[PDB]
Design a protein around this motif. Structure first.
Motif, short mmCIF file in Angstrom:
data_model
loop_
_atom_site.label_atom_id
_atom_site.label_comp_id
_atom_site.label_asym_id
_atom_site.label_seq_id
_atom_site.Cartn_x
_atom_site.Cartn_y
_atom_site.Cartn_z
N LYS A 1 -3.42 5.86 -3.42
CA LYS A 1 -3.44 4.55 -4.07
C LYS A 1 -2.42 3.58 -3.46
N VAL A 2 -1.17 4.01 -3.33
CA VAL A 2 -0.13 3.11 -2.81
C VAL A 2 -0.48 2.64 -1.40
N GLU A 3 -0.90 3.56 -0.53
CA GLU A 3 -1.27 3.18 0.86
C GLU A 3 -2.44 2.19 0.93
N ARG A 4 -3.42 2.37 0.05
CA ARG A 4 -4.57 1.49 -0.01
C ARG A 4 -4.16 0.12 -0.59
N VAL A 5 -3.69 0.12 -1.83
CA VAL A 5 -3.39 -1.11 -2.56
C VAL A 5 -2.39 -2.00 -1.80
N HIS A 6 -1.39 -1.39 -1.18
CA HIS A 6 -0.33 -2.11 -0.48
C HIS A 6 -0.45 -2.05 1.05
N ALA A 7 -1.65 -1.78 1.57
CA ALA A 7 -1.86 -1.71 3.02
C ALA A 7 -1.37 -2.95 3.80
N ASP A 8 -1.41 -4.12 3.17
CA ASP A 8 -0.94 -5.38 3.81
C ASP A 8 0.59 -5.47 3.95
N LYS A 9 1.35 -4.71 3.17
CA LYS A 9 2.80 -4.89 3.11
C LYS A 9 3.53 -4.15 4.23
N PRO A 10 4.50 -4.82 4.92
CA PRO A 10 5.29 -4.12 5.95
C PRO A 10 6.05 -2.88 5.48
N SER A 11 6.44 -2.84 4.21
CA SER A 11 7.14 -1.69 3.61
C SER A 11 6.25 -0.52 3.15
N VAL A 12 4.93 -0.63 3.27
CA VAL A 12 4.04 0.47 2.83
C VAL A 12 4.36 1.77 3.59
N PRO A 13 4.46 2.92 2.88
CA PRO A 13 4.80 4.18 3.57
C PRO A 13 3.59 4.79 4.28
N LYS A 14 3.23 4.20 5.42
CA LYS A 14 2.05 4.62 6.20
C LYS A 14 2.20 6.06 6.67
N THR B 1 9.39 8.10 6.33
CA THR B 1 8.29 7.16 5.99
C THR B 1 8.57 6.33 4.73
N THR B 2 9.38 6.85 3.82
CA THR B 2 9.64 6.20 2.55
C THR B 2 11.01 5.53 2.49
N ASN B 3 11.64 5.31 3.65
CA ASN B 3 12.97 4.72 3.75
C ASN B 3 14.00 5.54 2.98
N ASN B 4 14.02 6.84 3.28
CA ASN B 4 14.74 7.82 2.49
C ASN B 4 14.40 7.73 0.98
N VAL B 5 13.10 7.76 0.70
CA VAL B 5 12.61 7.70 -0.66
C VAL B 5 13.25 6.55 -1.45
N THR B 6 13.33 5.37 -0.84
CA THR B 6 13.91 4.17 -1.48
C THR B 6 12.80 3.13 -1.59
N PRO B 7 12.38 2.79 -2.82
CA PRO B 7 11.26 1.87 -2.92
C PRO B 7 11.70 0.46 -2.55
N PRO B 8 10.81 -0.32 -1.89
CA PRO B 8 11.18 -1.70 -1.59
C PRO B 8 11.18 -2.55 -2.88
#
Ligand SMILES: [Cl-]
Ligand SMILES: [Fe+2]
Ligand SMILES: [Fe+3]
Ligand SMILES: [O]
Length: 219
Positions: A99-112, A172-179
């Motif tokens: 869900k997060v990868e899909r919904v936020h695919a446009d965002k530079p911070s998405v954990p691809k 991938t998650t910026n050391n598990v730190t949400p943007p």
């Protein structure tokens, strides 16, 4: 002399040290043989303050000490507290990461790549845990622990591989730190990921630092 002792022994000697070592990105689980001094020196970290911080947690009350517990009891604890928990944690995290990868695919911070890494970890952990549960754990309970070098060295190489997936997940998650723009699903998933890392490190630590050496020694 905390600096001269192995991280593994320290993580099982003093409570909430696991979390402290987690704070410093020190692998007490699969790298538990390494001394605190050597680990601190590679991170360019201040050894004396870490020694002090440990004393603050050290003086605090004792939890369960697994170092001297019966091996059958360690085994049963691992199956229930760790294996069964990972079996329910991972499918949920995979769904949230999808869900997060899909919904936020446009965002530079998405954990691809997160979904793919969690999926690989789930598949590898599942075959790994099945082998432990079907062969290695029963063989230890039935008194053949001194005969378990073969499976143990393979299990340890697989723990290192799980360690590498965790590092890729952390990266991938910026050391598990949400943007700043992270939503409730994204934040709750990162909390789940931190919980999975904590559990998996304590799980691997209990196996590498207690169960496996004591089994091989004939206990
Ligand atoms: Cl052996
Ligand atoms: Fe295990
Ligand atoms: Fe294992
Ligand atoms: O494991």
């Amino acid at each position: 002399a905390y600096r001269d002792q192995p991280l593994g022994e320290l993580a099982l000697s003093i409570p909430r040290a696991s979390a402290l070592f987690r704070k410093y990105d020190m692998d007490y689980a699969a790298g538990g043989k390494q001394t605190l001094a050597r680990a601190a020196a590679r991170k360019e970290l201040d050894v004396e303050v870490i020694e002090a911080e440990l004393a603050k947690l050290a003086e605090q009350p004792i939890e369960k000490d697994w170092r001297s517990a019966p091996l059958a009891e360690i085994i049963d604890h691992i199956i229930v507290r760790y294996h069964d928990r990972h079996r329910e944690q991972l499918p949920e995290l995979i769904l949230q990461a999808t869900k997060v990868e899909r919904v936020h695919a446009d965002k530079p911070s998405v954990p691809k790549g997160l979904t793919k890494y969690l999926t690989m970890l789930h598949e590898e952990l599942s075959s790994h845990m099945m082998k432990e549960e079907q062969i290695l754990f029963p063989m230890i309970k039935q008194g053949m622990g001194s005969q378990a070098m073969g499976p143990i060295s393979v299990m340890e190489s697989e723990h290192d591989e799980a360690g590498e997936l965790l590092e890729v997940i952390k990266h991938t998650t910026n050391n598990v730190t949400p943007p700043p723009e992270a939503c409730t699903t994204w934040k709750a998933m990162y909390n789940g990921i931190n919980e999975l890392i904590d559990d998996l490190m304590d799980h691997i630590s209990l196996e590498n630092n207690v169960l496996f050496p004591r089994a091989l020694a004939g206990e």
